[PDB]
Scaffold this active site. Sequence first.
Site, PDB file in Angstrom:
ATOM      1  N   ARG A 169     -16.406 -45.141 -31.285  1.00  0.00           N
ATOM      2  CA  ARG A 169     -16.316 -43.721 -30.881  1.00  0.00           C
ATOM      3  C   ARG A 169     -17.106 -42.854 -31.841  1.00  0.00           C
ATOM      4  O   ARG A 169     -17.063 -43.094 -33.045  1.00  0.00           O
ATOM      5  CB  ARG A 169     -14.852 -43.256 -30.880  1.00  0.00           C
TER       6      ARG A 169
ATOM      7  N   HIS B 106     -13.432 -40.131 -34.479  1.00  0.00           N
ATOM      8  CA  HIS B 106     -12.134 -40.781 -34.308  1.00  0.00           C
ATOM      9  C   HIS B 106     -12.276 -42.315 -34.089  1.00  0.00           C
ATOM     10  O   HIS B 106     -11.454 -42.951 -33.407  1.00  0.00           O
ATOM     11  CB  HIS B 106     -11.341 -40.161 -33.139  1.00  0.00           C
TER      12      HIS B 106
ATOM     13  N   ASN C  25      -4.542 -33.250 -31.899  1.00  0.00           N
ATOM     14  CA  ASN C  25      -4.667 -33.602 -33.319  1.00  0.00           C
ATOM     15  C   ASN C  25      -3.336 -33.309 -33.978  1.00  0.00           C
ATOM     16  O   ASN C  25      -2.429 -32.707 -33.330  1.00  0.00           O
ATOM     17  CB  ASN C  25      -5.811 -32.806 -34.028  1.00  0.00           C
TER      18      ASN C  25
ATOM     19  N   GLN D   8     -18.443 -41.627 -22.621  1.00  0.00           N
ATOM     20  CA  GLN D   8     -17.950 -42.952 -22.172  1.00  0.00           C
ATOM     21  C   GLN D   8     -19.104 -43.816 -21.637  1.00  0.00           C
ATOM     22  O   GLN D   8     -19.035 -45.050 -21.632  1.00  0.00           O
ATOM     23  CB  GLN D   8     -16.834 -42.812 -21.139  1.00  0.00           C
TER      24      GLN D   8
ATOM     25  N   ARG E 215     -20.194 -45.729 -24.595  1.00  0.00           N
ATOM     26  CA  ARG E 215     -19.224 -46.708 -25.070  1.00  0.00           C
ATOM     27  C   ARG E 215     -19.131 -47.890 -24.130  1.00  0.00           C
ATOM     28  O   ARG E 215     -19.189 -49.029 -24.566  1.00  0.00           O
ATOM     29  CB  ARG E 215     -17.833 -46.110 -25.236  1.00  0.00           C
TER      30      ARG E 215
ATOM     31  N   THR F  98     -23.536 -15.552 -27.419  1.00  0.00           N
ATOM     32  CA  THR F  98     -23.051 -14.669 -28.478  1.00  0.00           C
ATOM     33  C   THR F  98     -21.752 -15.122 -29.010  1.00  0.00           C
ATOM     34  O   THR F  98     -20.998 -15.767 -28.296  1.00  0.00           O
ATOM     35  CB  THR F  98     -22.845 -13.270 -27.891  1.00  0.00           C
TER      36      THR F  98
ATOM     37  N   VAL G 245      15.704 -40.470 -59.647  1.00  0.00           N
ATOM     38  CA  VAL G 245      15.843 -41.669 -60.423  1.00  0.00           C
ATOM     39  C   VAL G 245      17.326 -41.956 -60.410  1.00  0.00           C
ATOM     40  O   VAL G 245      18.111 -41.084 -60.847  1.00  0.00           O
ATOM     41  CB  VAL G 245      15.365 -41.517 -61.857  1.00  0.00           C
TER      42      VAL G 245
HETATM   43  C1  HDD Z   1     -18.132 -31.072 -27.966  1.00  0.00           C
HETATM   44  C2  HDD Z   1     -17.785 -32.066 -28.791  1.00  0.00           C
HETATM   45  C3  HDD Z   1     -16.331 -32.204 -29.181  1.00  0.00           C
HETATM   46  C4  HDD Z   1     -15.512 -31.270 -29.673  1.00  0.00           C
HETATM   47  C5  HDD Z   1     -15.744 -29.776 -30.013  1.00  0.00           C
HETATM   48  C6  HDD Z   1     -14.257 -31.954 -29.926  1.00  0.00           C
HETATM   49  N1  HDD Z   1     -14.321 -33.300 -29.555  1.00  0.00           N
HETATM   50 FE1  HDD Z   1     -12.922 -34.671 -29.875  1.00  0.00          FE
HETATM   51  N2  HDD Z   1     -14.249 -36.121 -29.152  1.00  0.00           N
HETATM   52  C7  HDD Z   1     -15.496 -35.872 -28.671  1.00  0.00           C
HETATM   53  C8  HDD Z   1     -16.123 -34.650 -28.645  1.00  0.00           C
HETATM   54  C9  HDD Z   1     -15.620 -33.461 -29.099  1.00  0.00           C
HETATM   55  C10 HDD Z   1     -16.086 -37.129 -28.135  1.00  0.00           C
HETATM   56  C11 HDD Z   1     -17.485 -37.368 -28.811  1.00  0.00           C
HETATM   57  O1  HDD Z   1     -16.298 -36.943 -26.720  1.00  0.00           O
HETATM   58  C12 HDD Z   1     -15.035 -38.218 -28.383  1.00  0.00           C
HETATM   59  C13 HDD Z   1     -15.467 -39.482 -29.129  1.00  0.00           C
HETATM   60  C14 HDD Z   1     -14.831 -40.620 -28.388  1.00  0.00           C
HETATM   61  C15 HDD Z   1     -14.384 -39.986 -27.097  1.00  0.00           C
HETATM   62  O2  HDD Z   1     -13.880 -40.585 -26.150  1.00  0.00           O
HETATM   63  O3  HDD Z   1     -14.538 -38.659 -27.151  1.00  0.00           O
HETATM   64  C16 HDD Z   1     -13.927 -37.473 -29.038  1.00  0.00           C
HETATM   65  C17 HDD Z   1     -12.749 -38.030 -29.467  1.00  0.00           C
HETATM   66  C18 HDD Z   1     -11.598 -37.366 -29.825  1.00  0.00           C
HETATM   67  C19 HDD Z   1     -10.325 -38.008 -30.078  1.00  0.00           C
HETATM   68  C20 HDD Z   1     -10.061 -39.529 -30.060  1.00  0.00           C
HETATM   69  C21 HDD Z   1      -9.409 -39.996 -28.783  1.00  0.00           C
HETATM   70  C22 HDD Z   1      -9.139 -41.473 -28.864  1.00  0.00           C
HETATM   71  O4  HDD Z   1      -8.177 -41.771 -29.600  1.00  0.00           O
HETATM   72  O5  HDD Z   1      -9.866 -42.294 -28.258  1.00  0.00           O
HETATM   73  C23 HDD Z   1      -9.429 -37.012 -30.309  1.00  0.00           C
HETATM   74  C24 HDD Z   1      -7.943 -37.210 -30.622  1.00  0.00           C
HETATM   75  C25 HDD Z   1     -10.144 -35.762 -30.237  1.00  0.00           C
HETATM   76  N3  HDD Z   1     -11.461 -36.012 -29.953  1.00  0.00           N
HETATM   77  C26 HDD Z   1      -9.581 -34.532 -30.463  1.00  0.00           C
HETATM   78  C27 HDD Z   1     -10.265 -33.370 -30.505  1.00  0.00           C
HETATM   79  C28 HDD Z   1      -9.665 -32.078 -30.829  1.00  0.00           C
HETATM   80  C29 HDD Z   1      -8.154 -31.769 -30.864  1.00  0.00           C
HETATM   81  C30 HDD Z   1     -10.662 -31.176 -30.722  1.00  0.00           C
HETATM   82  C31 HDD Z   1     -10.619 -29.667 -30.930  1.00  0.00           C
HETATM   83  C32 HDD Z   1      -9.590 -28.928 -30.551  1.00  0.00           C
HETATM   84  C33 HDD Z   1     -11.917 -31.917 -30.531  1.00  0.00           C
HETATM   85  N4  HDD Z   1     -11.612 -33.243 -30.385  1.00  0.00           N
HETATM   86  C34 HDD Z   1     -13.126 -31.332 -30.389  1.00  0.00           C
HETATM   87 CA    CA Z   2      18.692 -38.992 -61.699  1.00  0.00          CA
HETATM   88 CA    CA Z   3     -19.645 -17.125 -26.980  1.00  0.00          CA
HETATM   89  O     O Z   4     -13.319 -34.922 -31.528  1.00  0.00           O
END
Ligand code: HDD
Ligand code: CA
Ligand code: CA
Ligand code: O
Lengths: 688, 688, 229
Positions: free
Chosen positions: B60, B63, B136, B354, B357, B431, B657
């Site tokens: 990934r 993460h 998260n 995906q 991946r 903006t 302790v």
């Molecule tokens: C525009 C890009 C982008 C942004 C701003 C974020 N993510 Fe992300 N995230 C991705 C692009 C991405 C991804 C590149 O699309 C991933 C990598 C693997 C996947 O499936 O998605 C990913 C994975 C990924 C995973 C792992 C899921 C797993 O266990 O397979 C989590 C938990 C999050 N993201 C959570 C977040 C949170 C809570 C965000 C902000 C609130 C966040 N991501 C912003």
């Molecule tokens: Ca003690």
């Molecule tokens: Ca904007």
């Molecule tokens: O992410």
Amino acid sequence: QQFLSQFYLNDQDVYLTSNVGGPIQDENSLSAGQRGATLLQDFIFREKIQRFDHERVPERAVHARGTGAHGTFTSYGDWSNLTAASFLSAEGKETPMFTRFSTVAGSRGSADTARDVHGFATRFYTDEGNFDIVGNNIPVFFIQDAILFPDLIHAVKPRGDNQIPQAATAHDSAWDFFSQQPSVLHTLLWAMAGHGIPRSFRHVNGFGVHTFRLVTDDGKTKLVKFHWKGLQGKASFVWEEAQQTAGKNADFMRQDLFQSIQAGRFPEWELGVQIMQEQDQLKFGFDLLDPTKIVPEELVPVTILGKMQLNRNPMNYFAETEQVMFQPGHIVRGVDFTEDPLLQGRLFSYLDTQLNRHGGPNFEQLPINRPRAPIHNNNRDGAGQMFIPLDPNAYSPNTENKGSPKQANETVGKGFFTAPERTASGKLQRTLSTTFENNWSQPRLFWNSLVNAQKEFIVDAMRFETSNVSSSVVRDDVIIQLNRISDNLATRVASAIGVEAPKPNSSFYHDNTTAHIGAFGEKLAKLDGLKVGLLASVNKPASIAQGAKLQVALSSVGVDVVVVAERMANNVDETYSASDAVQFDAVVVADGAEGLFGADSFTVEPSAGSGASTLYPAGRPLNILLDAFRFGKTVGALGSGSDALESGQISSERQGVYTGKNAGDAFAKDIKSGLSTFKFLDRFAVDE
Amino acid sequence: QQFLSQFYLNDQDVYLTSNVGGPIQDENSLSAGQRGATLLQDFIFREKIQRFDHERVPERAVHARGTGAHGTFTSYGDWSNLTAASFLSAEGKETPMFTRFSTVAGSRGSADTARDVHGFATRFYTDEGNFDIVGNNIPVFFIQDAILFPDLIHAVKPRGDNQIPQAATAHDSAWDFFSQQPSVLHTLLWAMAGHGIPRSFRHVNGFGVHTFRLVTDDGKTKLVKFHWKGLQGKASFVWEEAQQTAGKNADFMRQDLFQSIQAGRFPEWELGVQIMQEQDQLKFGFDLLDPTKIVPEELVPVTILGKMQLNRNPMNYFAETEQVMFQPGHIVRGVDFTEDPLLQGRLFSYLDTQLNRHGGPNFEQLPINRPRAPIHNNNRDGAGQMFIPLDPNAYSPNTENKGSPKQANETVGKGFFTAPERTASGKLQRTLSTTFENNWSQPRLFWNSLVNAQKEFIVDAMRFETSNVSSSVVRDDVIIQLNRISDNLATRVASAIGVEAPKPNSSFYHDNTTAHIGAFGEKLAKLDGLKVGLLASVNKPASIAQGAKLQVALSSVGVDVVVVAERMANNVDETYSASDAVQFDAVVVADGAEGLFGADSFTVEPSAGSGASTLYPAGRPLNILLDAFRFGKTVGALGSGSDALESGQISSERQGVYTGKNAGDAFAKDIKSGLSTFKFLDRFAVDE
Amino acid sequence: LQGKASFVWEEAQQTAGKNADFMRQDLFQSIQAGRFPEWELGVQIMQEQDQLKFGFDLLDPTKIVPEELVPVTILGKMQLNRNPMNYFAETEQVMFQPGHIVRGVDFTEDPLLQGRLFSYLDTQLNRHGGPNFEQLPINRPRAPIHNNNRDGAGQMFIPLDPNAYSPNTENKGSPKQANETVGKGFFTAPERTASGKLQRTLSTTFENNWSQPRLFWNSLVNAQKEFIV
Ligand code: HDD
Ligand SMILES: [Ca+2]
Ligand SMILES: [Ca+2]
Ligand SMILES: [O]
Ligand code: HDD
Ligand SMILES: *[C@@H]1O[C@H](CO[C@@H]2O[C@H](CO)[C@@H](O)[C@H](O)[C@H]2NC(C)=O)[C@@H](O)[C@H](O)[C@H]1NC(C)=O
Ligand SMILES: *[C@@H]1O[C@H](CO)[C@@H](O)[C@H](O)[C@H]1NC(C)=O
Ligand SMILES: *[C@@H]1O[C@H](CO)[C@@H](O)[C@H](O)[C@H]1NC(C)=O
Ligand SMILES: *[C@@H]1O[C@H](CO)[C@@H](O)[C@H](O)[C@H]1NC(C)=O
Ligand SMILES: *[C@@H]1O[C@H](CO)[C@@H](O)[C@H](O)[C@H]1NC(C)=O
Ligand SMILES: *[C@@H]1O[C@H](CO)[C@@H](O)[C@H](O)[C@H]1NC(C)=O
Ligand SMILES: *[C@@H]1O[C@H](CO)[C@@H](O)[C@H](O)[C@H]1NC(C)=O
Ligand SMILES: [Ca+2]
Ligand SMILES: [Ca+2]
Ligand SMILES: [Ca+2]
Ligand SMILES: [Ca+2]
Ligand SMILES: [Ca+2]
Ligand SMILES: [O]
């Protein structure tokens, strides 16, 4: 660097553009009003995020964790009476190189200092094609047939259900496999001696492992083992130190290499061959086709061919290091294969696997994989075709392109050729050669040849590892196999893991040795890139001033002094918070710093009146000193800094503990002596 | 489990076969005679090695390092007046789940206990489609627009030239970005408090981060924040203990979850929402579209919707955990998006990535990605097409398939629908919203709300990290930005790193707080899966016997006693060699073991006459006790075992302790009290 | 069992212009109509000692064995009787290999066959984009699968054995090795041998490129000679 610089992208003082040269900005998505939804027509957003979303490629199936450097080879001779290889055709002939070092089992991002076999892969960009010697830092491998590779690797790598443990053999499956497949024992001993936990990639040797052929233009052959003899010197850790390094700096060995090259401390190895005749395959008492066997240098000396120097770091790690795709099939005229069943199947694997990594067939067109020699053939197309072939008639034999490209073979065009006297005979079969069946005599040879401490290190590694094997059947099977090597080894391990002491089996016991085969026992050849941690205090400026003084006395040998103090005051290099014994090859208490090393410092209650520092964890200075001592490092103290040694219950009467009046030449001489010794083995208990 | 069980391969007591069901052997390559070359016609060799060669898929992009578990969701109500979401339609309604926890920056082999934001991704396999809340363990994110994601991640991930450092923000680029893009500061404080280094995945909360819409069948909306409120309790490490854990057990948190589930200690979280009106978007002094902002629970309480329990480990990690592909675009009827520009762009990324991946378009057909609801549509073909569509007329509108599949929308077929009162207005523009510009007030809220120790932890983290920043410009820029949060924070950090103490800049200073927002300061709700390491000796059998006795008094609260001794005797769980403080939530010296804890034990010379053990490194038992103490852990001693506390200069008068006469209920009660407190914060110095 | 039937060139050209799908349509329609075409599987059965005795090499794929020399022994019958439900899923994705061999059949040293074995395993990586092409419905066997192969993109199975290696004790030595004597394993014909220098050469036994073309030409009715001309 002429060649690779054509692909460099210089982004100093330029405007941002798309990948098709449209100037752009890339900080705000296009929205419908100030607080609106993002528009699909925002191609700037999508091109940027699409590149990001697709950055990753599959990690290598093995040797995923590794690090590369550019360098050069220099031939010491005209070796034409030994080999037709162009890169060896004249004294002083120079060839560019790229080398990648690695672990084996761990994924990307696993600790450098995991215990493992290490990769030592060297590419020569010869004028007659790319030639790769895809070697390791241990001369023998675990298994005798390439078809067993998935078995070995699946057993060593994490469990299939939960993917535990990372980068480790300390689990049931690994030891199940080792005991079920005793060919593994020779490599196992190497890896569980110091060779599995080297100090740096500059402090190992390399080995091609397999017997290869060298072949002259008139078809005459020799059998050879390839060697890379390091010119810095072997140096290795003890396990508890390698663990601590994994926690503090996962990048420790990659960083050592990068920094040493940036500092101009270019590491070197001599390329050597053990030269043998075709008739020597079985005469030594083991089979030259068996990759679990060494040829002791007492039987066949190493003939030195030339020298490799590594001297330039990559500009972009992904483009150069991640994408380098080594193959034993990258062979040149003057070298040929042998029937070693491990080599035989490797040839298939390394061509195939690049399809996974690159996602298509044109991986040899990546800059780091391209040759520095012309390419002319009838191969065509495939995804990612970067060339534009001018010949529309891509076949032989042709008249439409006047019979070109022309066939090259032994007699014309300097073609590759198979050594012409090689033969095959016998029934087609899937069998284990009876010549491969002694799995224990060479492990015993290795064991016999080690200093006492390094025997102990093997025992203690095996005790650590097998204590994590849940299966009693596996534990017993491990001891039974170890006992066939040595009843002493087996007994010593068994005692930690609840297995009955075994009765001796004298079948393979012997007392032969081979010289200097372990990681421990010899002084270093060069001190380049080693570090002395000077533990100082901002409250005693003279203590910090000792850094530069000591440095002036150590610069001529390439040793760096790192000044550690409570905060980043002038001339401080690191803070105590940021520091650890594992950063330093020697640890020295500066004169005036002794007050930071009180024996009560680990446990004193940090009340507002206590004077406890918030700039580092309780006890940190003394922890660094004590860890340095316990790990076997050179330890010193200047002036009244020696009081810190008393606080730590470290006597300067011990070997590798040095005191001096001041930071001048007399003290530097003693620290140099300590560093040359590298590890003080009398600090480790040995079985009696 | 019925659904996934259809894809299980049981390999108990069966013959080996190829992937097309031909029985085979796979241990020897086919050779031309006993010592011959391997033959190309060996299809067994090549199919085995080709599968091996192609095992890996891209990690990934973020993460990469993570761990998964199956579970179930149970709704506590009929929520139809709030949302049309079917999984929330009735009290008691159960939906299967899969959840993956992760770090962010590290590659897939990096240490669990790196400091980082952690992912908390929960899939509901609902009866109206897969619904993913990809969250998260921290409620706010670093950046305000998805287009910035490659900037943030390129800055945090390793340098482009050398790929150093792994899984760490402690380098120039990261802090350059944080200081240049002060939106980052809220999440930065969360991650540098305890939330960056949690004890386990069971001891964190989860958050959706963005504001979403819930939508009823008649189109009415609420704005919500999603919460996962953990029922075990927040628990976190100190930095030094997270580092040590990285070195000793890179799989510590993955192992914790696997073991807890195998033990039946199923972790739970309650799903909740902060329910708000459309008119609340700019009412609270910040913008609900801004993902760097929390809604304090004092302003809008969390309404609890139902409960997730994780209760089954995968059968094959790769097939299940590695291949699960979450997407915020996996949304169901009853939920809708908001114009949060971070969310907006996420929608594009997770569909696109995906492809990388999976290597093709049919990733939703992987077992772990399949829905538990009917699939009927006109999508066709693509590599890896696992289904066989019976309808040869794959278009709408059709008569050749009688108008099927039929369109589903708000009023027929339970279609997804965008909340119908949502509007766009304004000029198309790239903006930054002016409503997004206060980057500092909420970081100050968070800072104000911490116990003093956790403020110190943030300071000490930032001092550690920024001492590793080489650039003076960056260090100064960081202090300037911190100072807009709090002059106290900025001053305390500056003093470690050679930056002048800043003068107050008070525009965003305030004294507001929000309750229980840090990782430290509350007792644990459950002690399940916590571990007491009992340090015993094989030479005093009664010391080992205390293990089972103590265990009997702790089983009822889900706490395990692990007996540590010199070697694997009866009733010993681990050896000293194999052990470390970081394995144990509490450390207790058994009565009779005190002899192993001598104060001279780190430095005694281990000569033939010394009685030093070869079964563990010098000082290991005392090291475990001292580390446990310094790290803040519950420590105890039974009987004369208290002599070991004396050797280590640990007074029983200190908090956390405990001494006991024997291993009975009274002592067990003290150990439970200690575990509940979890960390003894009086062992950490605080600035004055 | 229907009978040979062929066009003249100008008719095949005209068919290409009017109906590019002419033969695919013929097959589809015939099966829909219940007119199921059939073929008999046959073998010309020869001995190991017959490789060169006929005056040409049995390893040479440019040579026929005339049925006057060795008759066709009929083994059984194929009937084609059901069209695909989805052409892409079934027909486009079917991935044939000569390496899909079963106990009771083995290869020969025909250098054309020898290298085919490599090609057809490799090329499916291009087509499918990954290693798990045998998991596509049309490629799956109707027989159990049990091995230590793992992972790869597009892994549709979930292996229960976490110990994917031999020899193991952790999974009680399973999956077990199958060979000639146990488990009905594949095996190479055990009397096959190799002898000689390793070489890249054209066998001298392969050098008559013209006598069999002449045999074919002689055997045609006058019109079909004319059609060749
Ligand atoms: C525009 C890009 C982008 C942004 C701003 C974020 N993510 Fe992300 N995230 C991705 C692009 C991405 C991804 C590149 O699309 C991933 C990598 C693997 C996947 O499936 O998605 C990913 C994975 C990924 C995973 C792992 C899921 C797993 O266990 O397979 C989590 C938990 C999050 N993201 C959570 C977040 C949170 C809570 C965000 C902000 C609130 C966040 N991501 C912003
Ligand atoms: Ca003690
Ligand atoms: Ca904007
Ligand atoms: O992410
Ligand atoms: C038949 C499988 C097989 C076997 C028996 C071996 N290898 Fe291997 N090795 C591979 C299959 C493979 C591979 C799967 O093809 C890799 C993974 C990445 C790559 O390019 O090749 C590879 C990588 C790889 C690398 C990493 C190159 C780099 O830095 O990119 C090294 C140094 C070695 N191998 C060394 C060896 C040694 C010295 C072997 C025994 C003498 C050995 N391997 C046996
Ligand atoms: C949801 O779907 C239905 C589709 O219904 C069709 O509507 C048009 C106009 O009335 C009519 O020509 C079709 O025959 C109708 N029936 C079918 C089965 O197609 C729309 O009518 C709704 O308005 C749609 N919109 C909403 C908001 O639900
Ligand atoms: C090779 O061998 C011949 C005969 O020994 C000798 O004349 C010549 O010097 C040798 N060539 C080289 C390059 O050493
Ligand atoms: C090498 O190739 C040449 C030129 O094509 C050919 O004519 C010659 O016979 C070949 N010799 C060998 C050794 O095969
Ligand atoms: C050493 O090896 C030689 C070589 O085979 C062998 O004959 C001899 O017996 C060995 N001697 C000892 C001490 O093992
Ligand atoms: C939903 O709302 C209406 C009116 O308030 C009421 O009749 C009913 O109790 C509510 N239904 C549910 C599912 O709670
Ligand atoms: C602090 O909280 C109070 C609530 O009493 C509120 O009125 C005020 O606006 C808040 N101030 C800031 C700067 O957040
Ligand atoms: C076939 O395999 C069986 C069972 O593993 C083995 O024991 C037997 O010796 C083998 N025989 C042959 C022909 O290799
Ligand atoms: Ca063999
Ligand atoms: Ca001394
Ligand atoms: Ca320590
Ligand atoms: Ca692809
Ligand atoms: Ca030939
Ligand atoms: O390898």
